[PDB]
Write a protein that binds this ligand. Structure first.
Ligand SMILES: [Zn+2]
Ligand SMILES: [Zn+2]
Ligand SMILES: [Zn+2]
Lengths: 78, 632, 252, 98, 159, 347, 48, 118
């Protein structure tokens, strides 16, 4: 039973592409075929385009309820 | 590795007891001399090394650590006679101006104390539907039969306040709503301002022991048929709480458990010891001399009490000529001077007389030169530069020109991966004075390397041992991080005062312009910052860690902060030359030829990754001509 | 205005004297400028100002100076810091025996200060150089003090001052120091019609729009400083100074 | 006016917008049930005006490349929230003046 | 010598050897280089944890099997890359209590020390006389009154 | 404190009193081994017998011993005799301790990495200290020689293959795996495994391919059939890449070309047959004429030498470094002079 | 206590012994904590 | 030009002595919705410190680490002790600013104890 926004807001995209860029850095396993760039944010932003970031988001409602959205499920805007 | 994961989910504060601080303290001071004559901190004094260390080179004598590893230890100044508590002196006076000495009760009517007891145990749960229902049933039970003989409880009030507390018990944590704390502060304020006034005692039917207060240092009783000492005030008020602890602890939800069944004691209104703050939290001071004044007055009190404990004369319950009343051997004035000095310690408005004061903890905490505005909500930051802005236009609107006097000092810690190596190899080879990038690297186990700028072998040595975990630790927890210089894509966070709206701080991409000493902005930015180029000076904050770069690309970027929060109009455009140039170029009369159109288009664009596609002539013959609208 | 303040730079000991090397007289000026003889102490330099929006670094109260003209001497100046040093008004411990002096064989002051404790004259000073060294004569413990300012200064003259009688001991001195202070980017100009500019970009001379007579300009002024400020007087002063430099006249 | 803005800031610092689109304080207290009585943002409401609808009827296909999802599944299902706009526009033909 | 499991160290839950084989849950601060290849990071952290004192499991472990994580969602914190877990593990622990019987393997004999081993690895320090006599003395069982757990990767018993 | 007074004194009766002092509630043996390790800077044989008696009295002290080995290493600025005696005593400890040999080997190899990178093939006292320590460890490897090879493979894959621009630490593996054909064969298997695995980073793969080329092109105890099989596997991997399709492709092509240049005589059998070894000229015709052009990223002197050889026979910092023949002439003579093959590419 | 009169709103919260649960943006930067703003309005999980 | 990196720390509130972020800029960063740029500039750059709390009580000035024993690292313990409760268990580390540890240790002069729920 999950009734929240189907879309990924800008703050979602900020935290996902920040943690995943630190989950590319700190010698963490990269999960896409790449060309040789050296910035973690470009890797973590080309993984969002390829639906590869495996993060679950706990969108807290004000009660304390949480819905578990996957980054794969959320429609990102172009 | 070695970092806290235990968060915090709530805070609460109440008073220490007089027993808790005695075993949270370490050393008693007993010496009114804060510094010696040699230069060392004073032995068994106020900057004693049994407390925290008074410098950065000596250690502590309680837990043996230096200034970087300790936090100081609490001492205490023993007080031989009891003083009032300067925080809760006003509520003590209001618990004596509404109480009397004949019967140890309070002169308030008991038709409303039971109502406030009955409501403030409901709002501890936070029901709030029945703060009017309890006064409705109080008025109905008081009109159907008048009964002053109901002394302790009323069964019809207590049936509801034990019904909606036992039932509806799970919402003991949803009491933090505004509607609950508003109502409870309202009811307690109506109590202290409406039902706690001095009146003739209706329970004992005798004369009133009237009390009155002056200049926040003195309580005086009167005669029913005069300086109220704090020892007799303890011996009086303790009996008051042993009679009225069922209600005077649900006003004062105090130390723990919300004062349930006589928990909050009369030990926090009265002080017989002054705990000093630790030595490193008061640097070498205005707050040490307050404690020295208290301690010298304690020396005077001991000088008096050694003479009032004579076997010839014992009046207690010249060699000291400097006390005031030289006639009588009592000297209440010394003790009220001690309580006034304690008032000087905790505040500086409860003192009105003593000129040898320096501001106490209220003036340290309250105003804009305090803590919550100067040090706790806005802090002096690191990794940020400041310089004068100047006009520039051949850099992007999401761009900032940065000098190479800032890109030799502004450093970003990059985690060494096997993915972004051979770029940080070059940025250790360069050394900290040359900017394609350079270093100040820290190793695995956590000590800095400090590569020197005069040599080259001791920099290529680091530039080859980078990716290898050459420590040999039993657990690999982290990698080497190189303190890289700022390069031509990095976000600096740009600040212009007064920061009066949301586009008054933005995230601009750095661009290291060589041979300069000013910041540079494009002209579209200097309307959102409200800049005027005439000596305006900006702060260039540089996010050190890595989640400070993600909102800096996505959220705080200049590109999306094109509109204004006020009504959504654009706050980015082109100011002065361009509105004339585009009104004259795109006029119907302009006709370029083929060599000029191709120059204008490539002055407009610059090194874009892509084939520059072109239009065709507006006039094909007699000459290939391009109108100025075709360039745009 | 940084202008030519005074003529007696050696016996005056002000804190800051802003001198302008090579100031000129204005070719176009009112008659009151000569009634009071303001050419004894003139304030600014003439300039060949074009009103063109040539560059793009030339907007919102900013202007463009030719770099060659800057390198040849356009509005070069100085600023004369002068520190009055006393050893009993500032430094005060006991017995007042503080004379400027060196102990023979001190590595701090080796070949950087003179044999009496004061610096040399003409000696360039930087941050962290020895600046004066004084000698408590009772014991011999010579101290030292270091030049704690940012800018590069040149020691210009050093005056040794006694007291009002003439029997004071060698403990007062007033070191006067030149600081060169040329036009850097971010230094402000103006005209005589109340129209400030800030120096934004020193444009190389071959890039300037040269005229049909051969001339480059010297300062480029934006045509968007005019219509909100309505200084017609800078237009007539431009025509007037051009026509006064072409005829040998000085125009009223 | 440092004082007025400081006081309105520290009395409206907590009022963030929640995943159920109701503006709430820092203690769950409900201030509004939709933000600003229709739930929208102040930047993103600039072209919803009727003077700017021919900009959005031309340029119709430039927008439908970040907005492909209103001719395929999981959206473009108005039939639960379009019955209301036949009910309301049906009730207002039997009750003209309210 | 390396401590293997080897059926709870050859089933030493027997006479003159007190122990317990119970599950224990610990706290995991995992380096984020193991988001694929997960199990070797968990057992690489735990191999730096064995053969010493801890708080969740009390005395000392010797072996472990079935190192699984409670809950499928790890706790990536706010500004953090270290993904956080909690591992249940079927440790084999033993700790000396006052009034128990333990192992014994004699090394030497002196006037004030009998050196007894605990399962061939841990050393038990026992005084040689009981203040009665210290002349004639020829598996040992003893009593424990205090415990002296060491600091760096080893363990001792004061018997 | 009695142990600090007794242990600071340095025979048989003192050894018996030392045993009496270390039985004695063995908690107090934590400073004693550190005070012995501070006395490492004759008497050393008495220290060896003392450490044998202490560490064979109880089995927990070898498991306790390794932070003392981490901490009590005499520094790089200390002289030649101190480091030589410390490494000699540490290799003796590695002899009589079969369990603690891995910690000793990884400590010595990390410290020789730190002494190798500081001395970058002379543009000089630390280079001579490196020479003495390398000759001592290679004499140890000659005196001892599978578990030793297993430990050196582990510390190689943990330390040296991530280390770029190495000059002397690869010599230990080079002299170890040259003693047996199977050791060099397993080392080539491990390098081909590190080059073949796509989950490893490409920098590690290119460094491993440079190590493959440097081992196949500058070794004398290697047979020809193993070189033929390894080059055949490399060319088969190049064909697998060229069937459907860059970095490790260029590294493998540079390794194959490097091996062909430094083995120009051994890659041909006889004078001239109807076909050479594995059709290597047709192999070069189908590799060089591709559209990827691998000759641009390689070293141009190697490309010119390869072009001259193929005419006569009818990333970049990861490819710059090579194992260097010149060294310090004090102690590395009798190891490098046996199994080095002549340079200058004269034919 | 950060807005105005930091000594009375300390004194009431010592008398009444008040809690706060730390969801206010002024409060959660006195202590070290992420503001429940846009990027504090959720926390972040990963399977396995 | 007030360029700052590894600035000197003062005695009370060991934070940069430095360039000021400012109380009104906090407001604009909260208006963006960038809680982590704000957590960086306030917490991570200026005055970050660890604090040891007895999680049962919650006090911060209650732990006392003992001195090392005179056995000279022969079973050196180096543990923490809530001497309010004399128990050496669940002394957990938290991350709070040093100015907050000055607020706690200055309310402690005012006889005010602050619980922390960890
Ligand atoms: Zn201490
Ligand atoms: Zn009465
Ligand atoms: Zn506690």
């Amino acid at each position: 039973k999950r009734i929240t926004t189907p879309y990924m807001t800008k703050y979602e995209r900020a935290r996902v592409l920040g943690t995943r860029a630190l989950q590319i850095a700190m010698c963490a396993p990269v999960m896409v075929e790449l060309e040789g760039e050296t910035d973690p944010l470009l890797i973590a932003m080309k993984e969002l385009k390829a639906r590869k970031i495996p993060i679950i988001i706990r969108r807290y409602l004000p009660d304390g309820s949480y819905e578990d959205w996957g980054v794969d499920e959320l429609i990102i805007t172009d | 590795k070695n970092m806290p994961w235990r968060r915090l989910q709530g805070i609460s504060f109440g008073m220490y007891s007089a027993e808790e601080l005695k075993k949270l303290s370490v050393k008693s001071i007993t010496n009114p001399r804060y510094l010696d004559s040699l230069g060392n901190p004073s032995a068994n004094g106020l900057y004693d090394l049994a407390l925290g260390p008074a410098d950065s080179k000596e250690v502590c004598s309680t837990c043996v650590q230096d200034f970087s590893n300790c936090s100081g230890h609490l001492g205490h100044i023993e007080l031989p006679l009891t003083v009032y508590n300067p925080l809760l002196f006003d509520k003590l006076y209001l618990l004596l101006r509404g109480s009397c000495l004949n019967c140890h009760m309070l002169t308030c009517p008991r038709a409303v104390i039971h109502l406030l007891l009955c409501q403030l145990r409901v709002l501890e749960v936070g029901a709030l539907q029945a703060v009017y229902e309890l006064e409705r049933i109080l008025n109905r039970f008081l009109e159907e039969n008048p009964d002053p003989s109901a002394s302790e409880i009323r069964e019809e009030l207590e049936q509801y306040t034990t019904e909606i507390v036992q039932n509806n018990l799970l919402g003991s944590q949803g009491a933090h709503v505004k509607n609950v704390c508003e109502s409870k502060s309202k009811l307690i304020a109506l109590f202290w301002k409406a039902h706690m006034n001095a009146k003739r005692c209706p329970h004992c039917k005798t004369g009133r022991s009237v009390v009155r207060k002056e200049h926040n240092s003195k309580l005086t009783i009167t005669f029913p048929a005069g300086y109220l000492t704090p020892t007799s005030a303890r011996e009086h008020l303790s009996a008051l709480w042993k009679n009225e602890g069922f209600f005077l602890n649900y006003l004062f939800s105090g130390m723990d458990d919300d004062g349930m069944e006589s928990r909050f004691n009369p030990s926090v209104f009265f002080l017989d010891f002054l705990v000093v703050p630790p030595s490193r939290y008061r640097p070498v001071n205005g707050q040490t001399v307050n404690l020295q004044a208290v301690m010298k007055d304690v020396v005077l009190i001991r000088k008096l009490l050694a003479l009032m404990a004579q076997e010839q004369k014992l009046p207690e319950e010249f060699l000291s000529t400097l006390p005031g009343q030289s006639l009588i051997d009592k000297l209440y004035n010394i003790w009220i001077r001690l309580q006034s000095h304690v008032n000087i310690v905790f505040d500086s408005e409860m003192d009105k007389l003593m000129m040898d004061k320096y501001p106490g903890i209220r003036q340290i905490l309250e105003k804009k030169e305090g803590l919550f505005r100067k040090h706790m909500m806005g802090k002096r930051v690191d990794y940020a530069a400041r310089s004068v802005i100047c006009p520039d236009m051949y850099i992007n609107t999401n761009e900032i020109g940065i000098p190479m006097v800032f890109a030799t000092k502004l450093t970003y810690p990059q985690p060494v991966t096997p993915w972004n190596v051979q770029e940080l190899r070059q940025a250790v080879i360069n050394g900290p004075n040359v900017h394609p990038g350079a270093s100040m690297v820290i190793n695995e186990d956590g000590s800095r390397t400090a590569l020197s700028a005069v040599d080259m072998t001791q920099r290529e040595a680091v530039a080859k041992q980078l990716l290898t975990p050459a420590t040999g630790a039993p657990k690999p927890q982290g990698t080497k991080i190189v303190c890289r210089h700022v390069k031509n894509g990095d976000i600096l966070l740009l600040n212009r005062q007064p920061t009066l709206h949301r586009p008054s701080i933005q995230a601009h991409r750095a661009r290291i312009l060589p041979e300069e000493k000013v910041l540079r902005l494009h002209y579209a930015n200097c309307k959102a910052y409200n800049a005027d180029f005439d000596g305006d000076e900006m702060n260039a904050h540089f996010p050190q860690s890595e989640l400070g770069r993600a909102e800096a690309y996505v959220l705080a970027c200049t590109d999306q902060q094109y509109l204004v929060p006020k009504d959504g109009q654009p706050l980015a455009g082109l100011i002065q030359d361009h509105m004339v140039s585009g009104a004259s170029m795109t006029t119907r009369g302009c006709f370029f030829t083929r060599e000029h159109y191709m120059e204008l288009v490539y002055r407009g664009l610059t090194d874009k990754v892509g084939r520059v596609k072109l239009l065709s002539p507006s006039i094909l013959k007699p000459f290939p001509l391009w109108t100025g609208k075709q360039v745009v | 205005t940084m202008g030519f303040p005074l003529l007696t730079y050696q016996d005056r000991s002000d804190n800051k004297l802003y001198r302008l090397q090579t100031p000129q007289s204005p070719l176009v000026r009112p008659s009151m400028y000569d009634y009071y003889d303001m050419d004894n102490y003139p304030i600014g330099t003439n300039a060949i100002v074009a009103v063109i929006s040539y560059t793009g670094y030339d907007m919102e109260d900013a202007m463009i100076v030719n770099k060659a003209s800057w390198e040849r001497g356009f509005a070069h100046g100085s600023v004369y810091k002068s520190e009055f040093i006393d050893l009993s008004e500032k430094i005060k411990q006991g017995d007042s025996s503080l004379v400027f002096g060196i102990k023979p064989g001190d590595p701090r002051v080796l070949q950087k200060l003179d044999d009496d404790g004061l610096p040399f004259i003409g000696a360039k000073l930087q941050y962290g150089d020895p600046y004066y060294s004084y000698l408590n004569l009772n014991t011999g413990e010579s101290f030292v003090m270091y030049y704690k300012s940012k800018e590069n200064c040149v020691v210009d003259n050093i005056k040794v001052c006694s007291n009002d009688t003439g029997s004071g001991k060698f403990k007062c001195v007033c070191i006067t120091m030149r600081v060169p202070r040329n036009p850097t980017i971010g230094d402000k100009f103006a005209s005589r019609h109340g129209q400030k500019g800030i120096l934004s970009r020193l444009w190389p001379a071959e890039d300037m729009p040269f005229t049909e007579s051969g001339m480059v300009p010297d300062i480029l002024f934006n045509p968007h400083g005019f219509p909100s400020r309505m200084t017609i007087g800078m237009l007539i002063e431009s025509m007037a100074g051009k026509s006064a430099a072409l005829h040998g006249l000085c125009h009223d | 006016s440092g004082y007025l803005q400081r006081c309105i800031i520290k009395h409206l610092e907590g009022l963030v917008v929640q995943y159920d689109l109701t503006v709430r304080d820092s203690d769950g207290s409900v201030v509004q049930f939709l933000y600003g009585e229709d739930g929208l943002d102040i930047p993103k409401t600039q072209f919803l005006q009727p003077k700017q609808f021919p900009f959005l009827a031309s340029n119709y296909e430039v927008i439908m490349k970040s907005q492909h999802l209103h001719e395929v599944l999981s959206r473009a299902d108005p039939k639960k929230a379009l019955h209301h706009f036949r009910a309301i526009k049906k009730w207002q033909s039997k009750h003209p003046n309210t | 010598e390396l401590p293997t499991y080897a059926a709870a160290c050859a089933l030493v839950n027997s006479r003159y050897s007190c122990l317990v084989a119970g599950p224990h849950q610990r706290h995991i601060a995992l380096s984020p280089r193991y988001l694929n290849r997960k199990r070797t990071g968990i057992r690489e952290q735990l191999d730096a944890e064995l053969l010493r004192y801890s708080e969740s499991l009390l005395g000392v472990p010797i072996a472990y099997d079935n190192i699984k994580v409670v809950g499928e969602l790890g706790d990536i914190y706010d500004d953090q890359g270290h993904i956080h877990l909690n591992i249940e593990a079927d440790f084999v622990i033993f700790c000396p209590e006052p009034g128990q019987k333990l192992m014994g393997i004699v090394n030497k004999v002196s006037s004030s020390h009998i050196g007894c081993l605990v399962h061939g690895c841990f050393n038990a320090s026992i005084p040689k006389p009981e203040q009665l006599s210290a002349e004639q003395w020829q598996e040992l069982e003893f009593e424990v009154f205090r415990l002296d757990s060491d600091a760096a990767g080893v363990f001792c018993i004061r018997g | 404190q009695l142990i600090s007074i007794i242990l600071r004194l340095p025979v048989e009766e003192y050894l018996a009193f030392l045993g009496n002092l270390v039985s004695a509630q063995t908690v107090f043996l934590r400073p004693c081994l550190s005070m012995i390790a501070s006395h490492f800077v004759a008497n050393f044989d008495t220290c060896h017998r003392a450490l044998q008696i202490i560490a064979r009295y109880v089995p927990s002290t070898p498991w306790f011993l390794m932070p003392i080995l981490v901490e009590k290493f005499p520094f790089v600025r200390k002289s030649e005799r101190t480091l030589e005696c410390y490494v000699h005593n540490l290799l003796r400890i590695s002899v009589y301790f079969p369990t603690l040999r891995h910690e000793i080997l990884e400590l010595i190899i990390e410290k020789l990495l730190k002494l190798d990178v500081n001395a970058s093939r002379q543009g000089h006292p630390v280079a001579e200290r490196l020479d003495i320590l390398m000759s001592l460890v290679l004499s140890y490897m000659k005196d001892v020689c599978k578990d030793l090879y297993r430990d050196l493979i582990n510390i190689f894959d943990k330390l040296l293959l991530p280390t770029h621009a190495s000059c002397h630490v690869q010599f230990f593996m080079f002299y170890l795996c040259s003693f047996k054909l199977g050791f060099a064969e397993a080392f080539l298997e491990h390098l081909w495994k590190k080059l073949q695995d796509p989950s490893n980073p490409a920098i590690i793969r290119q460094a491993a391919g440079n190590y493959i080329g440097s081992f196949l092109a500058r070794a004398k105890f290697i047979p020809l059939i193993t070189v033929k099989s390894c080059l055949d596997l490399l060319v088969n991997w190049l064909h697998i890449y060229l069937n459907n399709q860059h970095g490790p492709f260029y590294s493998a092509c540079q390794a194959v070309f490097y091996t062909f240049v430094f083995r120009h005589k051994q890659l041909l059998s006889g004078n001239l047959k109807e076909g050479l070894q594995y059709l290597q000229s047709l192999n070069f015709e189908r590799i060089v004429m591709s559209q990827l052009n691998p000759l641009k990223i390689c070293l141009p002197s190697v490309v010119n030498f390869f072009a001259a050889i193929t005419n006569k026979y009818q990333t970049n910092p990861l490819d710059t470094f090579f194992p260097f023949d010149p060294c310090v002439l004090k102690r590395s003579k009798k190891f490098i002079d046996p199994i080095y093959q002549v340079w200058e590419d004269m034919s | 206590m950060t807005f105005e009169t930091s000594f009375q709103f300390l004194k009431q919260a010592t008398m009444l012994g008040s809690h706060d649960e730390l969801r206010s943006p002024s409060a959660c930067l006195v202590v070290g904590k992420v503001v429940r703003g846009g990027t504090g309005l959720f926390e972040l999980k990963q399977p396995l | 030009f007030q360029v700052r990196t590894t600035g000197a720390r003062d005695r009370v509130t060991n934070q940069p002595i430095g360039i000021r972020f400012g109380e009104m800029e906090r407001d604009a960063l909260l208006a963006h919705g960038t809680s982590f740029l704000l957590h960086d500039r306030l917490f991570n750059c200026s005055d970050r410190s660890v604090a040891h709390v007895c999680v049962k009580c919650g006090s911060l000035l209650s732990p006392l680490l003992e001195k090392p024993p005179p056995s000279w690292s022969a079973m050196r313990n180096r543990k923490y002790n809530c001497t309010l409760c004399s128990r050496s268990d669940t002394i957990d580390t938290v991350s709070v600013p040093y100015v907050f540890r000055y607020f706690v240790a200055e309310l402690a002069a005012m006889n005010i104890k602050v619980k922390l729920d960890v």
